[model samples]
Target: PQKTAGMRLGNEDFKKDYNIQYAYMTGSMYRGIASEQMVIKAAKAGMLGFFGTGGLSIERIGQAIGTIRSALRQGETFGMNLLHHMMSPDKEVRMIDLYLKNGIHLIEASAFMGITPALVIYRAKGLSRNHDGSVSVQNKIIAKVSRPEVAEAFLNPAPAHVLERLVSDNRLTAGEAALAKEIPMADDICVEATLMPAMIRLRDRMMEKHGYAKKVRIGAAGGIGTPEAAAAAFLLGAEFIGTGSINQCTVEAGTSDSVKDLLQEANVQDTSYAPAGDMFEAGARVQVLKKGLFFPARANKLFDLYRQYNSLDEIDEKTKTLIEEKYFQRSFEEVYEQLKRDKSPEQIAKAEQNPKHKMAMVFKWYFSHTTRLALEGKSESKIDYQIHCGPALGAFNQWVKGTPLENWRNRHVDLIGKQLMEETAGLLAQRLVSITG
Candidate 1:
């Protein structure tokens, strides 16, 4: 059953709100992209834009797509990103279908948590090509994952169940299913720094499996805040690059000036991982920035709490007592259950109706220097915190010399691409006197 059947229909006429902005940080994947304005500006700048649809409501997804289309000129190219997780399996597939109906051509299949079964639908159907002759049927699938196995899954479409599902839905043709996919071509493959060596090997292995080892192109991300490392990505056979931390500083990234300033202050060693919540495991093996004004302390506490008690039930009695003492509410049962993520609708409604527990019930979105609000500069968000991120940031620290934070922040994507291109061209122009020589 397709997930969109009972979904709410789109509004007949949406207000052309150029200011419709939203932030997405789904379970700590890429944090946030400050999508709306950044995308609009990118599109208007004669470049492609990706409408961020992760972690947003279906209605919100519709609104974003509509806004981008209305905001951009006709014939502009754009894509949307989706993160497939245990919480939302069919959601992304349905959302991609939504884009297809509305004339959106590109789709960034992120998390590559494993090659999504949804891609089988995309692959067998053959992609749609835009007016410019670029294969529009999600021709450019950009995957952001830091695992080797995940990359392997993307290179090979599998789990016959996926193909079976497509067949049952009439989404695949008999020949297409039996057709031999000799080449798995992803317009872009992004490498997260946590496991670049393994990722690169996985990329190599993927090609070898299909007899096209040399044909695959790769992109480097994570730890890429500097030119030399960016150069190394190309030197190491990366054909493209994606950045996260550096984007926070870009004039158009939509992050606040304070957020960008913090980014400028960060040296390579400045980042320390502190757990903020379940979404990102900062202190748990992965280090995060600790110098921030608020999140560091808050993040550590969240991790400590999570560790003290594996699930919601065992949160220390003392902790409960403290919460009950400090927490404003009419009843302990109501306040306690909400604190932990366990409750039903009736439970939620009863709790919400009481003013004593009002503040606790609020949805405090992650206040990271979110690209969302800084660009839109909207005051509607209750949490205005900023989270600076990127593989480029760590990479910047390792440049031939200490790379200036100011220059890294101000770089544009196109310029980054051109720089990589120049260095790669130069490297190729030189003679290699290794074993072959």
Candidate 2:
């Protein structure tokens, strides 16, 4: 008999470890796109959801944490996103402190290039030895990474220097620091975007090389939408699955109705890769919806201009006029004046000294503005909405084209997760039977 259970899908230990019904999760989206309500719904449905705490202020994040905690019953699990603040380390420290203060235990650490002292502190603060001589990790981290090097970093224990400094600064006890070395930085490492097969092999090799008694579980994210995709992830050796873009189109998603409408109409090829606003200078890219929006092209043009010219004044008159009038709708000086108000004195001084830096900063402003326009659902700025999404959402739309889920209002995060997992189990069972026959 070809029988498979949805609850038996993925790693059974993963479901038990997280205290979730399914080995599935909804990854965080920026600016609360994965809202508190979404997290609550997922927890209620017995799946994990991370509150999109990126791009939110400390006070707002605290309030969101409280709201989610209050809504869920005891033993119901929810997580938060700990975004890697490359330009601002202090902000990362403050956010971790806030998370600790509120007793938030599970965090999905994203975009981290390497381990930091802040991460070590969070992992070590409440670590203790159990009666069975096993380490008790109070705070759990699920690091999302695309590269093998970053995966290796998370698979290893906290770096010696970082833990030593934490101990010397009285942030962690000497005993906790010693305990920290026994475990990896993240309880689970989620492979983001691509490299699923290669990353899983690499993870296995590292586990054997280090002889880690506690296995660091691997999960898959990015491009998981339909049952087929979820089944493929498990076949590729992903112990668990994570969904991101699909959740944004649900009713509980924190984005604008207009944005949801646009996403609902998208197909599998409707996304384009554009420069990431936060890491514009590093040339980092993020997949965004490009079906009816000019953001991808406009953002790419700005990056091209930034690379071609040393300063804003060096641009040709025709091009500069077009940018000032059409793209920004404000003069360069006006934008710089607004930036000066928000930027620090030292940052302004550096921008004044480096013309290219100033140009990059000004160009990067458009990305943020576009994001705000999308989130606010400003119909007048519809052409300029920058919705960070992926092809997975498009695939999801295709799967539900004829159903009631074709309408964004009819979609809910919990229902989607449950249906997807159930169908995936059925699909996997059929495929196995067919192969053997």
Candidate 3:
């Protein structure tokens, strides 16, 4: 069947509220895997795609925002990735300022361990105390999380401690702080990012906890590549769904051809989890490509060393030499000096006081460098390439292997989204018919 005779998604609220046609979003892949062009195309196609803002500077993010805003219609919808900045809260604050100044109302909050003052302020500032004793939201946040506790935090109002701190820091007004207490931490909560049942269970749990069955919406993401996967998410209670890995294979993805080539070749089991580069100290995990690449193994090894040794000097001389010659390809002194130039003063000061932190910084520098190597397509250093991906792309590859969409060059972002949603609706119809028979 080319299209379902009568096809629909259950979550009309997401589509209606966001002013998008479909309950589908292309989640941000850091360093512009979800590019500005992708956002424009997705918005034009009646869906929204988040721009990858995780690794870019404030100026770059703002410029992309400008470009997207100019290219998109006044009422066209788009989103930005608001990755947590634990190392520098100033960056996040400045980002928030940019969003407010430039009129960005939607954010895909990622890597957030807990509620923060900036987030509370963003939500509170948009709040309108209704005549009916309700608060109307102007800004909407879709928090992406993996753990139950994290979901619990997002399901409730901003913590009192965070609110007080924001006020003391002069980030929020006293009035805003009072308002923050009334609103939930996020307008929507997205889960598994990659389990339909698990995502639904978490939403159900949170709704039970906060009595937010109707107040806050729940979405699902991660490993969503095919019609069956998408249908499963809707069946599991997702108000909306977002795709990550599948988007990376599209034409408008901002990554290099080499990375795309790698992504195109991936299979269902080709992905492995490694220590996330941005959250090194917290030991956060991000799924990445492992097939025909040494990054996952090498990254895991680095994390293992990070856990085993307190400082760089604690390692034996032979191991130190091996790391310098093979992995870092330079002296620690050189890396530290370069890091000092770019790092915030507080970060530099922390590394000076804490040897373990200093070592972790140096180790993390390698991950960043490897990411650059991959993006630039430096085949000489292909083994060290750092690419964030999930199993979904592999599933997508299998699904489209023999079709015209097999080649990345043939895949456009908007068309891919349309195809997925349309096909998913078709699949749902088939399932319903099968059940009745």
Candidate 4:
């Protein structure tokens, strides 16, 4: 008999460790796209949903933590996102402080390029020795990484220098610092964008080389929307699966209805890569909806201009005029004036000295503006809206085309996760039976 239950999919230990019925999680979206409601619903349905805390204020995230904690019954599982802030490490430290104060036990650490002291502090603070003489990790991290090097950092225990520094500073007790060295920086590593067998093999090899007795679970995220895709990840040795793009189109997602409507109409090729706003200067990119938006082209043009020209004044007058009038809808002077009000005096003074710095600051503003337009669903600026998404959502739309799930309003996060897992398990069973025969 070819029988496979959704509960039986993925590693059984993953389910026990996360306290989730199925080893499935909904990855966070920036700025509350993965809402408190979404987290609550996923927890109630026995799946982990991370509240998107990226780009939110500490107070805002604290309120969300309160809401989610009050909504769920005791022992229900949920998590929060700790997005890496490259330009401002202080923000990450403050966020960790807020999470610790609020008792946020689990976090999905995303977009990190390397290990930081803030991350080490979070991992080491609550570490203790159990009655059985084993170290217990009170704060759990599921690190999301795209590169093997970053994954390797999480695979190993906290750096000895960092632990020693923290202990000396009294941030971590000597006992806690010692225990932290015994455990990896993260309990799980989620390979973002897609996962291959080679990555999993690399993880295992690294673990063996490091001589660690405990195994760090490897999960897959990005490009997982359909049952076949999900099943493929599991068959490739993924211990868990994470969903992102598909969840944005669901009802519980914290985006405007207009954004959801546009998402529902997207095809597999509807997404385009654009410069990430926070890391625009670093040339980092993020996948965004392109079917009905001008953001991608505009963002790319800005990056190109930034690369070619040393400063705004160095650009040809004609091009500058066009950019100021069309893209910015105001003169560069006006943009600077607005920025003066928002940015710190030190930042503005630096921009004042460096024309190129001023140009970068002005161009980066458009990215944030477009994101706000999308979140607010400004119909007049619909073509300029910036929505972070991936091709998986388009594939998901195709999968549910003729079904009730086709409509974004009818789609619920928990139902989508459950259906995907169930169908994936069934698909695996069928494939195994056929291979055996």
Q: Write the per-residue lDDT of candidate 1 for residues 1-437, one digit (tens) a residue.
A: 33121111111111011111111111112323546665666555433456556556778778877777788775555667766654456776787677656666556666556755566655545544347633333334556666666666666644567666667778776555544143353534566663555566777777777674224445566666554555465556554555556555555554455555556566676666543322443232344454544444544554555445544346667865654443222245654554446434654575466642232232112222233443344444413333545445545434423543245455554344334334534444352334246
TM-score of 1: 0.66
lDDT of 4 at 134: 84
Which has the greatest lDDT? Answer: 2
After superposition, candidate 3 runs with Cα above 4 Å error: 1-7, 131-133, 160-180, 193-214, 378-380
- Candidate lDDT scores, in order, read 0.50, 0.90, 0.83, 0.89
lDDT of 4 by residue, 142-188 (tens): 99998998998998889999988988999999999988877888889
How well is each residue in 259-344 modelled by candidate 2, as lDDT tens digits? 99899998989998999899998899899999888889999999999988999999999989998999999989999999999889
Show the lowest summed lDDT stretch of 10 residues, model 3: 1-10
Worst 10-residue lDDT window for candidate 4 reads 1-10
Q: Write one digit per residue (lDDT tens) for candidate 3, span 1-437.
A: 33232225757677787887787888887887789999999999888689999889898999999899899866798999998978768788888888988879999998888888778878877667667766677888989988878877888888988878878988778877776676678877788653556656766666777664245677888889998998888877878888888888888999889888888999999999999888877888889999888778878888888899999889888878877888888988889999999888888999999999999999999889988888786576567788888888898899899999999999998898888888888888899889998
Give stretches of model 4 more than 4 Å off. 1-4, 210-213
lDDT of 3 at 110: 83
Candidate 1 yields a Cα-based lDDT of: 0.50
Q: Which of the predicted structures, 1 or 3, would earn the higher lDDT when compared with the native?
A: 3
- Which is the winner by TM-score between candidate 3 and candidate 4? 4
Check candidate 3 and list the clashing pairs: 193-221, 193-222, 194-221, 194-222, 194-223
